Amino acid sequence: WSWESYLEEQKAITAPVSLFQDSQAVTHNKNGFKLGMKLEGIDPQHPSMYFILTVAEVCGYRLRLHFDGYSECHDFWVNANSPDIHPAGWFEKTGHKLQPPKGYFSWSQYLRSTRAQAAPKHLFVSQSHSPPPLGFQVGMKLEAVDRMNPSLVCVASVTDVVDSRFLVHFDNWDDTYDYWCDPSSPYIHPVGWCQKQGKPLTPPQDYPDPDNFCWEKYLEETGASAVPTWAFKVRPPHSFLVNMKLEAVDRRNPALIRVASVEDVEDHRIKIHFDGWSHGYDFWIDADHPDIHPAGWCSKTGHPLQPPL
Amino acid sequence: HRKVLRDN
Ligand SMILES: [Cl-]
């Protein structure tokens, strides 16, 4: 199997590399992560929380991470340029809470106990060493689309800031709805946006007399400021066209990456189809998702590519 | 008769 023959046979084109974020396209970095190295990382199921993680497996430019002390059923895959992982010691140097291993804090002591090596600092794209997003401070308030219930635009807060990104939290809900984004995210807006737009604003869970929620009063009673309106940037719509081909991680078996097609498009999202598979497997994904890549990515990075079914 | 957003 080859891309060239397949594109000839299908009279199809691949999505140009230029269409992707640099981070999605880059193939020339080696994976420096090794089996058993330890590190710190976000829990993908609880994006506000940080855990001790160990390298369980490496395939090309991807790695499988294991929560120390917990079941291997929670193991998950990231790319080696993930910004959601950090070197040992990052939590205490940067004001983040680290959850300890299950049942279990000092790294020197834990490394002595386990006789393990921490992943070296140079491997990590994100170490809180780069200029944060201007205008976005911890504690500030905004309006955000609940990406899991996207008919709702809700009262939200910035609860974490790391390098170029910040964490959006839904006031009074749990952290399962939290997400990391940057100032150009199409899912965030300034305080007052819903009112300007004539759209309903979903107030915090269990806010007393919710029909009379008022930002002016909420900010006063929470000692909070709005993210300034100038800080929000307009992200251009992506330029993926229907039928363009690429590679994409399979969500049903995340170990696998498959030949894929652009089935449909929105301004900021792309509907992915796995060539040869049922359209039942088609799924919407944001255009900036770290798990889509230009044709050639697997082959250049040393990861197997599943050809069409 | 109140309608409430529930996530459990
Ligand atoms: Cl467990």
PDB file of C-alpha atoms and ligand atoms in Angstrom:
ATOM      1  CA  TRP A   1       0.000   0.000   0.000  1.00  0.00           C
ATOM      2  CA  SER A   2       1.095   3.564  -0.806  1.00  0.00           C
ATOM      3  CA  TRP A   3      -0.552   7.023  -0.734  1.00  0.00           C
ATOM      4  CA  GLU A   4       0.561   7.791  -4.320  1.00  0.00           C
ATOM      5  CA  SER A   5      -1.112   4.663  -5.799  1.00  0.00           C
ATOM      6  CA  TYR A   6      -4.199   5.203  -3.664  1.00  0.00           C
ATOM      7  CA  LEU A   7      -4.590   8.833  -4.741  1.00  0.00           C
ATOM      8  CA  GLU A   8      -4.078   7.801  -8.398  1.00  0.00           C
ATOM      9  CA  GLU A   9      -6.642   5.010  -8.036  1.00  0.00           C
ATOM     10  CA  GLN A  10      -9.220   7.231  -6.285  1.00  0.00           C
ATOM     11  CA  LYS A  11      -8.458  10.335  -8.382  1.00  0.00           C
ATOM     12  CA  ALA A  12      -8.227  12.115  -5.004  1.00  0.00           C
ATOM     13  CA  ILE A  13      -6.038  14.757  -3.326  1.00  0.00           C
ATOM     14  CA  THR A  14      -4.553  14.925   0.182  1.00  0.00           C
ATOM     15  CA  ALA A  15      -5.148  17.976   2.382  1.00  0.00           C
ATOM     16  CA  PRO A  16      -2.042  20.167   1.921  1.00  0.00           C
ATOM     17  CA  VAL A  17       0.385  20.231   4.877  1.00  0.00           C
ATOM     18  CA  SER A  18      -0.148  24.023   4.902  1.00  0.00           C
ATOM     19  CA  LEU A  19      -3.731  23.457   6.034  1.00  0.00           C
ATOM     20  CA  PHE A  20      -2.611  22.023   9.390  1.00  0.00           C
ATOM     21  CA  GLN A  21      -1.159  23.540  12.572  1.00  0.00           C
ATOM     22  CA  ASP A  22       2.651  23.158  12.633  1.00  0.00           C
ATOM     23  CA  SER A  23       2.239  20.905  15.705  1.00  0.00           C
ATOM     24  CA  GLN A  24      -0.017  18.476  13.714  1.00  0.00           C
ATOM     25  CA  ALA A  25       2.387  18.373  10.748  1.00  0.00           C
ATOM     26  CA  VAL A  26       5.861  18.195  12.314  1.00  0.00           C
ATOM     27  CA  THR A  27       7.638  14.870  11.558  1.00  0.00           C
ATOM     28  CA  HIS A  28      11.309  15.666  11.952  1.00  0.00           C
ATOM     29  CA  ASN A  29      11.455  15.581  15.787  1.00  0.00           C
ATOM     30  CA  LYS A  30      12.486  12.285  17.236  1.00  0.00           C
ATOM     31  CA  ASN A  31      10.528  10.729  20.084  1.00  0.00           C
ATOM     32  CA  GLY A  32      12.917  10.949  23.056  1.00  0.00           C
ATOM     33  CA  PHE A  33      10.476   9.349  25.538  1.00  0.00           C
ATOM     34  CA  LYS A  34      11.564   5.886  26.789  1.00  0.00           C
ATOM     35  CA  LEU A  35       9.798   3.021  28.589  1.00  0.00           C
ATOM     36  CA  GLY A  36       9.461   3.619  32.340  1.00  0.00           C
ATOM     37  CA  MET A  37      10.319   7.363  32.333  1.00  0.00           C
ATOM     38  CA  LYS A  38       8.163   9.284  34.789  1.00  0.00           C
ATOM     39  CA  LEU A  39       6.537  12.704  34.376  1.00  0.00           C
ATOM     40  CA  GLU A  40       3.500  14.858  35.329  1.00  0.00           C
ATOM     41  CA  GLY A  41       0.386  15.302  33.182  1.00  0.00           C
ATOM     42  CA  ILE A  42      -3.247  16.344  32.902  1.00  0.00           C
ATOM     43  CA  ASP A  43      -5.920  13.691  33.434  1.00  0.00           C
ATOM     44  CA  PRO A  44      -7.815  13.787  30.048  1.00  0.00           C
ATOM     45  CA  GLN A  45     -11.046  12.869  31.956  1.00  0.00           C
ATOM     46  CA  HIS A  46     -10.418  15.688  34.520  1.00  0.00           C
ATOM     47  CA  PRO A  47      -8.456  18.390  32.567  1.00  0.00           C
ATOM     48  CA  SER A  48      -7.839  20.549  35.672  1.00  0.00           C
ATOM     49  CA  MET A  49      -6.019  17.738  37.570  1.00  0.00           C
ATOM     50  CA  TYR A  50      -2.350  16.604  37.341  1.00  0.00           C
ATOM     51  CA  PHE A  51      -1.067  13.108  38.073  1.00  0.00           C
ATOM     52  CA  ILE A  52       2.235  11.246  38.112  1.00  0.00           C
ATOM     53  CA  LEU A  53       2.475   9.400  34.789  1.00  0.00           C
ATOM     54  CA  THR A  54       4.811   6.690  33.472  1.00  0.00           C
ATOM     55  CA  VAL A  55       5.691   5.855  29.816  1.00  0.00           C
ATOM     56  CA  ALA A  56       3.998   2.418  29.233  1.00  0.00           C
ATOM     57  CA  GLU A  57       4.649   2.177  25.436  1.00  0.00           C
ATOM     58  CA  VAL A  58       6.036   4.201  22.545  1.00  0.00           C
ATOM     59  CA  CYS A  59       4.965   3.936  18.940  1.00  0.00           C
ATOM     60  CA  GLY A  60       6.586   6.429  16.557  1.00  0.00           C
ATOM     61  CA  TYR A  61       5.956   9.988  17.713  1.00  0.00           C
ATOM     62  CA  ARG A  62       3.219   8.780  20.139  1.00  0.00           C
ATOM     63  CA  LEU A  63       3.403   7.357  23.657  1.00  0.00           C
ATOM     64  CA  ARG A  64       1.000   5.570  26.001  1.00  0.00           C
ATOM     65  CA  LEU A  65       0.927   6.963  29.571  1.00  0.00           C
ATOM     66  CA  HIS A  66      -0.020   5.063  32.716  1.00  0.00           C
ATOM     67  CA  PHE A  67      -1.380   6.603  35.938  1.00  0.00           C
ATOM     68  CA  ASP A  68       1.004   5.345  38.698  1.00  0.00           C
ATOM     69  CA  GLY A  69      -0.923   3.236  41.242  1.00  0.00           C
ATOM     70  CA  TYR A  70      -4.127   3.135  39.155  1.00  0.00           C
ATOM     71  CA  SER A  71      -5.461   0.574  36.682  1.00  0.00           C
ATOM     72  CA  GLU A  72      -3.972   0.258  33.216  1.00  0.00           C
ATOM     73  CA  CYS A  73      -7.542   0.627  31.902  1.00  0.00           C
ATOM     74  CA  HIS A  74      -7.000   4.428  32.291  1.00  0.00           C
ATOM     75  CA  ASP A  75      -3.864   4.423  30.079  1.00  0.00           C
ATOM     76  CA  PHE A  76      -4.040   6.981  27.226  1.00  0.00           C
ATOM     77  CA  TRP A  77      -2.023   8.061  24.163  1.00  0.00           C
ATOM     78  CA  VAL A  78      -0.456  11.447  23.489  1.00  0.00           C
ATOM     79  CA  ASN A  79       2.018  12.751  20.941  1.00  0.00           C
ATOM     80  CA  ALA A  80       5.551  13.518  22.023  1.00  0.00           C
ATOM     81  CA  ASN A  81       4.959  17.257  21.420  1.00  0.00           C
ATOM     82  CA  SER A  82       1.881  17.247  23.749  1.00  0.00           C
ATOM     83  CA  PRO A  83       1.575  20.428  25.858  1.00  0.00           C
ATOM     84  CA  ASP A  84      -0.488  18.393  28.419  1.00  0.00           C
ATOM     85  CA  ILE A  85       2.558  16.769  30.046  1.00  0.00           C
ATOM     86  CA  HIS A  86       5.354  18.353  32.072  1.00  0.00           C
ATOM     87  CA  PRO A  87       8.666  17.318  33.651  1.00  0.00           C
ATOM     88  CA  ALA A  88       9.005  16.000  37.228  1.00  0.00           C
ATOM     89  CA  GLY A  89       8.970  18.962  39.638  1.00  0.00           C
ATOM     90  CA  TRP A  90       6.969  21.246  37.330  1.00  0.00           C
ATOM     91  CA  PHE A  91       3.911  21.258  39.692  1.00  0.00           C
ATOM     92  CA  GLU A  92       5.772  22.796  42.662  1.00  0.00           C
ATOM     93  CA  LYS A  93       7.718  25.307  40.607  1.00  0.00           C
ATOM     94  CA  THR A  94       4.506  26.581  38.912  1.00  0.00           C
ATOM     95  CA  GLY A  95       1.722  26.575  41.563  1.00  0.00           C
ATOM     96  CA  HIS A  96      -0.085  23.395  40.439  1.00  0.00           C
ATOM     97  CA  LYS A  97      -1.443  20.588  42.605  1.00  0.00           C
ATOM     98  CA  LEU A  98      -0.082  17.097  41.892  1.00  0.00           C
ATOM     99  CA  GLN A  99      -2.280  14.132  42.785  1.00  0.00           C
ATOM    100  CA  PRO A 100      -0.096  11.406  44.391  1.00  0.00           C
ATOM    101  CA  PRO A 101       0.086   7.773  43.138  1.00  0.00           C
ATOM    102  CA  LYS A 102      -2.970   5.723  44.215  1.00  0.00           C
ATOM    103  CA  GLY A 103      -2.907   5.169  47.999  1.00  0.00           C
ATOM    104  CA  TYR A 104       0.414   6.952  48.422  1.00  0.00           C
ATOM    105  CA  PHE A 105       4.925  13.755  48.180  1.00  0.00           C
ATOM    106  CA  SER A 106       8.532  14.070  47.117  1.00  0.00           C
ATOM    107  CA  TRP A 107       9.977  13.177  43.680  1.00  0.00           C
ATOM    108  CA  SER A 108      13.498  12.493  45.075  1.00  0.00           C
ATOM    109  CA  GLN A 109      11.975  10.021  47.565  1.00  0.00           C
ATOM    110  CA  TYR A 110       9.626   8.428  44.983  1.00  0.00           C
ATOM    111  CA  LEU A 111      12.445   8.012  42.437  1.00  0.00           C
ATOM    112  CA  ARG A 112      14.598   6.427  45.146  1.00  0.00           C
ATOM    113  CA  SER A 113      11.742   3.998  46.037  1.00  0.00           C
ATOM    114  CA  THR A 114      10.992   3.060  42.434  1.00  0.00           C
ATOM    115  CA  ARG A 115      14.589   3.327  41.077  1.00  0.00           C
ATOM    116  CA  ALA A 116      13.069   5.138  38.101  1.00  0.00           C
ATOM    117  CA  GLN A 117      14.252   7.981  35.862  1.00  0.00           C
ATOM    118  CA  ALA A 118      12.273  11.189  35.372  1.00  0.00           C
ATOM    119  CA  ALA A 119      11.735  12.099  31.677  1.00  0.00           C
ATOM    120  CA  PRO A 120      14.390  14.781  30.969  1.00  0.00           C
ATOM    121  CA  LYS A 121      13.136  18.410  30.781  1.00  0.00           C
ATOM    122  CA  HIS A 122      14.252  18.981  27.188  1.00  0.00           C
ATOM    123  CA  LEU A 123      11.565  16.537  25.897  1.00  0.00           C
ATOM    124  CA  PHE A 124       8.691  18.816  26.949  1.00  0.00           C
ATOM    125  CA  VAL A 125       7.220  21.507  24.699  1.00  0.00           C
ATOM    126  CA  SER A 126       5.382  23.015  27.707  1.00  0.00           C
ATOM    127  CA  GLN A 127       7.298  23.929  30.888  1.00  0.00           C
ATOM    128  CA  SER A 128       5.577  27.254  31.707  1.00  0.00           C
ATOM    129  CA  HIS A 129       8.711  29.024  30.362  1.00  0.00           C
ATOM    130  CA  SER A 130       7.015  30.862  27.481  1.00  0.00           C
ATOM    131  CA  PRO A 131       4.971  34.169  27.492  1.00  0.00           C
ATOM    132  CA  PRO A 132       1.394  33.492  28.563  1.00  0.00           C
ATOM    133  CA  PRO A 133      -1.705  34.608  26.636  1.00  0.00           C
ATOM    134  CA  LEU A 134      -1.956  38.410  27.154  1.00  0.00           C
ATOM    135  CA  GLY A 135      -5.101  39.493  28.995  1.00  0.00           C
ATOM    136  CA  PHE A 136      -6.014  36.031  30.350  1.00  0.00           C
ATOM    137  CA  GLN A 137      -5.304  35.820  34.119  1.00  0.00           C
ATOM    138  CA  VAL A 138      -6.337  33.145  36.639  1.00  0.00           C
ATOM    139  CA  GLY A 139      -9.609  34.223  38.316  1.00  0.00           C
ATOM    140  CA  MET A 140     -10.955  36.257  35.357  1.00  0.00           C
ATOM    141  CA  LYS A 141     -14.463  35.636  33.924  1.00  0.00           C
ATOM    142  CA  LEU A 142     -15.896  35.121  30.407  1.00  0.00           C
ATOM    143  CA  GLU A 143     -18.660  33.359  28.543  1.00  0.00           C
ATOM    144  CA  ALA A 144     -17.971  29.968  27.077  1.00  0.00           C
ATOM    145  CA  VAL A 145     -19.724  27.389  24.968  1.00  0.00           C
ATOM    146  CA  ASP A 146     -20.138  24.127  26.772  1.00  0.00           C
ATOM    147  CA  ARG A 147     -18.451  21.987  24.085  1.00  0.00           C
ATOM    148  CA  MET A 148     -20.258  18.924  25.476  1.00  0.00           C
ATOM    149  CA  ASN A 149     -23.669  20.682  25.372  1.00  0.00           C
ATOM    150  CA  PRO A 150     -22.967  23.257  22.680  1.00  0.00           C
ATOM    151  CA  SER A 151     -26.456  24.800  22.654  1.00  0.00           C
ATOM    152  CA  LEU A 152     -25.331  26.359  26.014  1.00  0.00           C
ATOM    153  CA  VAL A 153     -23.210  29.512  26.420  1.00  0.00           C
ATOM    154  CA  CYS A 154     -22.301  29.738  30.113  1.00  0.00           C
ATOM    155  CA  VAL A 155     -20.760  31.749  32.928  1.00  0.00           C
ATOM    156  CA  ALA A 156     -17.077  30.663  32.973  1.00  0.00           C
ATOM    157  CA  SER A 157     -13.699  31.388  34.629  1.00  0.00           C
ATOM    158  CA  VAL A 158     -10.035  31.053  33.780  1.00  0.00           C
ATOM    159  CA  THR A 159      -8.698  28.618  36.419  1.00  0.00           C
ATOM    160  CA  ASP A 160      -5.190  27.785  35.075  1.00  0.00           C
ATOM    161  CA  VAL A 161      -2.635  29.342  32.677  1.00  0.00           C
ATOM    162  CA  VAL A 162       0.257  27.383  31.158  1.00  0.00           C
ATOM    163  CA  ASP A 163       2.440  28.740  28.359  1.00  0.00           C
ATOM    164  CA  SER A 164       0.208  29.870  25.475  1.00  0.00           C
ATOM    165  CA  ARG A 165      -2.982  28.244  26.851  1.00  0.00           C
ATOM    166  CA  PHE A 166      -5.501  28.676  29.659  1.00  0.00           C
ATOM    167  CA  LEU A 167      -8.147  26.514  31.237  1.00  0.00           C
ATOM    168  CA  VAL A 168     -11.827  27.382  30.966  1.00  0.00           C
ATOM    169  CA  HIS A 169     -13.977  26.205  33.853  1.00  0.00           C
ATOM    170  CA  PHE A 170     -17.805  26.203  34.153  1.00  0.00           C
ATOM    171  CA  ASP A 171     -18.655  27.964  37.407  1.00  0.00           C
ATOM    172  CA  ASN A 172     -20.312  25.607  39.922  1.00  0.00           C
ATOM    173  CA  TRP A 173     -20.081  22.516  37.686  1.00  0.00           C
ATOM    174  CA  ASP A 174     -17.430  19.780  38.021  1.00  0.00           C
ATOM    175  CA  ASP A 175     -14.222  19.880  35.954  1.00  0.00           C
ATOM    176  CA  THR A 176     -15.341  17.284  33.371  1.00  0.00           C
ATOM    177  CA  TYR A 177     -16.569  20.205  31.202  1.00  0.00           C
ATOM    178  CA  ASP A 178     -13.263  22.127  31.506  1.00  0.00           C
ATOM    179  CA  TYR A 179     -11.130  22.729  28.475  1.00  0.00           C
ATOM    180  CA  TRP A 180      -7.794  24.238  27.544  1.00  0.00           C
ATOM    181  CA  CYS A 181      -7.697  26.779  24.791  1.00  0.00           C
ATOM    182  CA  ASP A 182      -6.018  29.905  23.548  1.00  0.00           C
ATOM    183  CA  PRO A 183      -7.228  33.498  22.932  1.00  0.00           C
ATOM    184  CA  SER A 184      -8.538  32.670  19.431  1.00  0.00           C
ATOM    185  CA  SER A 185     -10.770  29.741  20.475  1.00  0.00           C
ATOM    186  CA  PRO A 186     -14.138  30.069  18.709  1.00  0.00           C
ATOM    187  CA  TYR A 187     -15.802  28.708  21.884  1.00  0.00           C
ATOM    188  CA  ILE A 188     -15.120  31.699  24.149  1.00  0.00           C
ATOM    189  CA  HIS A 189     -16.467  35.247  24.324  1.00  0.00           C
ATOM    190  CA  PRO A 190     -16.250  38.296  26.662  1.00  0.00           C
ATOM    191  CA  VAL A 191     -18.618  38.987  29.516  1.00  0.00           C
ATOM    192  CA  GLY A 192     -21.650  40.654  27.877  1.00  0.00           C
ATOM    193  CA  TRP A 193     -21.470  38.774  24.546  1.00  0.00           C
ATOM    194  CA  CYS A 194     -24.785  36.843  25.035  1.00  0.00           C
ATOM    195  CA  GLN A 195     -26.544  40.094  26.011  1.00  0.00           C
ATOM    196  CA  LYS A 196     -25.166  41.884  22.921  1.00  0.00           C
ATOM    197  CA  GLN A 197     -26.212  38.910  20.751  1.00  0.00           C
ATOM    198  CA  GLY A 198     -29.712  38.619  22.267  1.00  0.00           C
ATOM    199  CA  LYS A 199     -28.768  35.036  23.291  1.00  0.00           C
ATOM    200  CA  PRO A 200     -29.506  33.407  26.659  1.00  0.00           C
ATOM    201  CA  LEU A 201     -26.642  33.083  29.109  1.00  0.00           C
ATOM    202  CA  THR A 202     -26.621  29.926  31.211  1.00  0.00           C
ATOM    203  CA  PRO A 203     -25.784  31.105  34.810  1.00  0.00           C
ATOM    204  CA  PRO A 204     -23.687  28.979  37.304  1.00  0.00           C
ATOM    205  CA  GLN A 205     -25.233  25.681  38.480  1.00  0.00           C
ATOM    206  CA  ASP A 206     -27.698  26.332  41.338  1.00  0.00           C
ATOM    207  CA  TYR A 207     -27.292  30.116  41.201  1.00  0.00           C
ATOM    208  CA  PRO A 208     -30.092  31.558  43.352  1.00  0.00           C
ATOM    209  CA  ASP A 209     -32.928  33.084  41.318  1.00  0.00           C
ATOM    210  CA  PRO A 210     -31.151  32.172  38.065  1.00  0.00           C
ATOM    211  CA  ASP A 211     -33.595  34.040  35.795  1.00  0.00           C
ATOM    212  CA  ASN A 212     -32.320  37.276  37.397  1.00  0.00           C
ATOM    213  CA  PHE A 213     -28.563  36.519  37.083  1.00  0.00           C
ATOM    214  CA  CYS A 214     -26.639  39.686  36.348  1.00  0.00           C
ATOM    215  CA  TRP A 215     -22.877  39.770  35.421  1.00  0.00           C
ATOM    216  CA  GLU A 216     -22.400  43.157  37.124  1.00  0.00           C
ATOM    217  CA  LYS A 217     -23.593  41.706  40.446  1.00  0.00           C
ATOM    218  CA  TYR A 218     -21.795  38.346  39.975  1.00  0.00           C
ATOM    219  CA  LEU A 219     -18.420  40.029  39.368  1.00  0.00           C
ATOM    220  CA  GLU A 220     -18.914  42.307  42.368  1.00  0.00           C
ATOM    221  CA  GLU A 221     -19.852  39.396  44.702  1.00  0.00           C
ATOM    222  CA  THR A 222     -16.952  37.195  43.451  1.00  0.00           C
ATOM    223  CA  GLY A 223     -14.241  39.917  43.520  1.00  0.00           C
ATOM    224  CA  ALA A 224     -13.560  39.074  39.867  1.00  0.00           C
ATOM    225  CA  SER A 225     -12.789  41.008  36.690  1.00  0.00           C
ATOM    226  CA  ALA A 226     -13.863  40.188  33.118  1.00  0.00           C
ATOM    227  CA  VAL A 227     -11.224  39.068  30.613  1.00  0.00           C
ATOM    228  CA  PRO A 228     -10.746  42.342  28.659  1.00  0.00           C
ATOM    229  CA  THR A 229     -12.544  42.396  25.292  1.00  0.00           C
ATOM    230  CA  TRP A 230      -9.342  43.202  23.322  1.00  0.00           C
ATOM    231  CA  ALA A 231      -7.769  39.876  24.468  1.00  0.00           C
ATOM    232  CA  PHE A 232     -10.143  37.737  22.395  1.00  0.00           C
ATOM    233  CA  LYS A 233      -8.843  37.053  18.874  1.00  0.00           C
ATOM    234  CA  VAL A 234     -10.824  35.917  15.801  1.00  0.00           C
ATOM    235  CA  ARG A 235      -9.569  32.540  14.531  1.00  0.00           C
ATOM    236  CA  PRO A 236      -9.954  32.264  10.717  1.00  0.00           C
ATOM    237  CA  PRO A 237     -12.075  29.338   9.518  1.00  0.00           C
ATOM    238  CA  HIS A 238      -9.941  26.393   8.413  1.00  0.00           C
ATOM    239  CA  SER A 239      -9.509  25.605   4.666  1.00  0.00           C
ATOM    240  CA  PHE A 240     -10.114  21.872   4.546  1.00  0.00           C
ATOM    241  CA  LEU A 241     -12.473  20.904   1.665  1.00  0.00           C
ATOM    242  CA  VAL A 242     -14.762  17.859   1.442  1.00  0.00           C
ATOM    243  CA  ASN A 243     -12.976  14.769  -0.035  1.00  0.00           C
ATOM    244  CA  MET A 244      -9.492  15.903   0.986  1.00  0.00           C
ATOM    245  CA  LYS A 245      -7.554  12.980   2.507  1.00  0.00           C
ATOM    246  CA  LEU A 246      -5.309  12.751   5.572  1.00  0.00           C
ATOM    247  CA  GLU A 247      -4.462  10.547   8.592  1.00  0.00           C
ATOM    248  CA  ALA A 248      -6.418  10.349  11.862  1.00  0.00           C
ATOM    249  CA  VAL A 249      -6.253   8.419  15.144  1.00  0.00           C
ATOM    250  CA  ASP A 250      -9.163   5.957  15.469  1.00  0.00           C
ATOM    251  CA  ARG A 251     -11.265   6.833  18.551  1.00  0.00           C
ATOM    252  CA  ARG A 252     -12.388   3.249  19.021  1.00  0.00           C
ATOM    253  CA  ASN A 253      -8.832   1.903  19.174  1.00  0.00           C
ATOM    254  CA  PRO A 254      -6.552   4.885  19.901  1.00  0.00           C
ATOM    255  CA  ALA A 255      -3.437   2.763  19.201  1.00  0.00           C
ATOM    256  CA  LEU A 256      -4.409   2.854  15.494  1.00  0.00           C
ATOM    257  CA  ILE A 257      -4.090   5.601  12.896  1.00  0.00           C
ATOM    258  CA  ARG A 258      -6.094   5.236   9.651  1.00  0.00           C
ATOM    259  CA  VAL A 259      -6.389   6.571   6.132  1.00  0.00           C
ATOM    260  CA  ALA A 260      -9.075   9.249   6.360  1.00  0.00           C
ATOM    261  CA  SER A 261     -11.279  11.565   4.314  1.00  0.00           C
ATOM    262  CA  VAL A 262     -12.936  14.940   4.945  1.00  0.00           C
ATOM    263  CA  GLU A 263     -16.618  14.027   4.786  1.00  0.00           C
ATOM    264  CA  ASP A 264     -18.107  17.415   5.771  1.00  0.00           C
ATOM    265  CA  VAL A 265     -16.924  20.822   7.070  1.00  0.00           C
ATOM    266  CA  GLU A 266     -17.888  23.622   9.410  1.00  0.00           C
ATOM    267  CA  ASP A 267     -15.973  26.871  10.049  1.00  0.00           C
ATOM    268  CA  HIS A 268     -13.765  25.250  12.741  1.00  0.00           C
ATOM    269  CA  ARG A 269     -14.612  21.572  12.552  1.00  0.00           C
ATOM    270  CA  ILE A 270     -14.164  18.725  10.137  1.00  0.00           C
ATOM    271  CA  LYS A 271     -16.162  15.544   9.801  1.00  0.00           C
ATOM    272  CA  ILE A 272     -13.756  12.611   9.465  1.00  0.00           C
ATOM    273  CA  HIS A 273     -14.490   9.452   7.520  1.00  0.00           C
ATOM    274  CA  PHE A 274     -12.297   6.351   7.615  1.00  0.00           C
ATOM    275  CA  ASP A 275     -11.927   5.187   3.979  1.00  0.00           C
ATOM    276  CA  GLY A 276     -13.400   1.689   3.572  1.00  0.00           C
ATOM    277  CA  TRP A 277     -15.340   1.808   6.826  1.00  0.00           C
ATOM    278  CA  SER A 278     -19.030   2.448   7.513  1.00  0.00           C
ATOM    279  CA  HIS A 279     -20.132   6.094   7.614  1.00  0.00           C
ATOM    280  CA  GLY A 280     -21.463   5.037  11.040  1.00  0.00           C
ATOM    281  CA  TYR A 281     -17.855   5.618  12.217  1.00  0.00           C
ATOM    282  CA  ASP A 282     -17.736   9.217  10.902  1.00  0.00           C
ATOM    283  CA  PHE A 283     -17.100  11.833  13.621  1.00  0.00           C
ATOM    284  CA  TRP A 284     -16.760  15.611  14.037  1.00  0.00           C
ATOM    285  CA  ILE A 285     -13.435  16.931  15.304  1.00  0.00           C
ATOM    286  CA  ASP A 286     -12.030  20.448  15.790  1.00  0.00           C
ATOM    287  CA  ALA A 287      -9.574  21.429  13.105  1.00  0.00           C
ATOM    288  CA  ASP A 288      -6.853  22.005  15.770  1.00  0.00           C
ATOM    289  CA  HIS A 289      -7.192  18.523  17.346  1.00  0.00           C
ATOM    290  CA  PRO A 290      -3.730  16.949  17.990  1.00  0.00           C
ATOM    291  CA  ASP A 291      -4.929  13.599  16.542  1.00  0.00           C
ATOM    292  CA  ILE A 292      -5.240  14.545  12.874  1.00  0.00           C
ATOM    293  CA  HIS A 293      -2.184  14.764  10.621  1.00  0.00           C
ATOM    294  CA  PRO A 294      -1.238  15.298   6.939  1.00  0.00           C
ATOM    295  CA  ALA A 295      -0.737  12.235   4.694  1.00  0.00           C
ATOM    296  CA  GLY A 296       2.799  10.929   5.246  1.00  0.00           C
ATOM    297  CA  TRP A 297       2.846  11.654   8.992  1.00  0.00           C
ATOM    298  CA  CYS A 298       2.805   7.962  10.072  1.00  0.00           C
ATOM    299  CA  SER A 299       5.433   6.935   7.546  1.00  0.00           C
ATOM    300  CA  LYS A 300       7.732   9.870   8.421  1.00  0.00           C
ATOM    301  CA  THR A 301       7.402   9.402  12.222  1.00  0.00           C
ATOM    302  CA  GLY A 302       7.604   5.585  12.273  1.00  0.00           C
ATOM    303  CA  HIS A 303       4.017   4.731  13.262  1.00  0.00           C
ATOM    304  CA  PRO A 304       1.992   2.033  11.402  1.00  0.00           C
ATOM    305  CA  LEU A 305      -0.809   3.362   9.095  1.00  0.00           C
ATOM    306  CA  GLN A 306      -3.978   1.338   8.608  1.00  0.00           C
ATOM    307  CA  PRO A 307      -4.849   1.348   4.868  1.00  0.00           C
ATOM    308  CA  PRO A 308      -8.555   1.583   3.821  1.00  0.00           C
ATOM    309  CA  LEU A 309     -10.831  -1.315   4.780  1.00  0.00           C
TER     310      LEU A 309
ATOM    311  CA  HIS B   1     -43.259  23.726  37.352  1.00  0.00           C
ATOM    312  CA  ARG B   2     -39.478  24.159  37.023  1.00  0.00           C
ATOM    313  CA  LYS B   3     -37.217  22.509  34.472  1.00  0.00           C
ATOM    314  CA  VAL B   4     -33.668  22.020  35.708  1.00  0.00           C
ATOM    315  CA  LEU B   5     -30.404  21.143  33.951  1.00  0.00           C
ATOM    316  CA  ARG B   6     -29.201  17.854  35.467  1.00  0.00           C
ATOM    317  CA  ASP B   7     -25.967  16.032  34.627  1.00  0.00           C
ATOM    318  CA  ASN B   8     -26.509  12.866  36.707  1.00  0.00           C
TER     319      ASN B   8
HETATM  320 CL    CL C   1      -8.194   2.181  39.351  1.00  0.00          CL
END
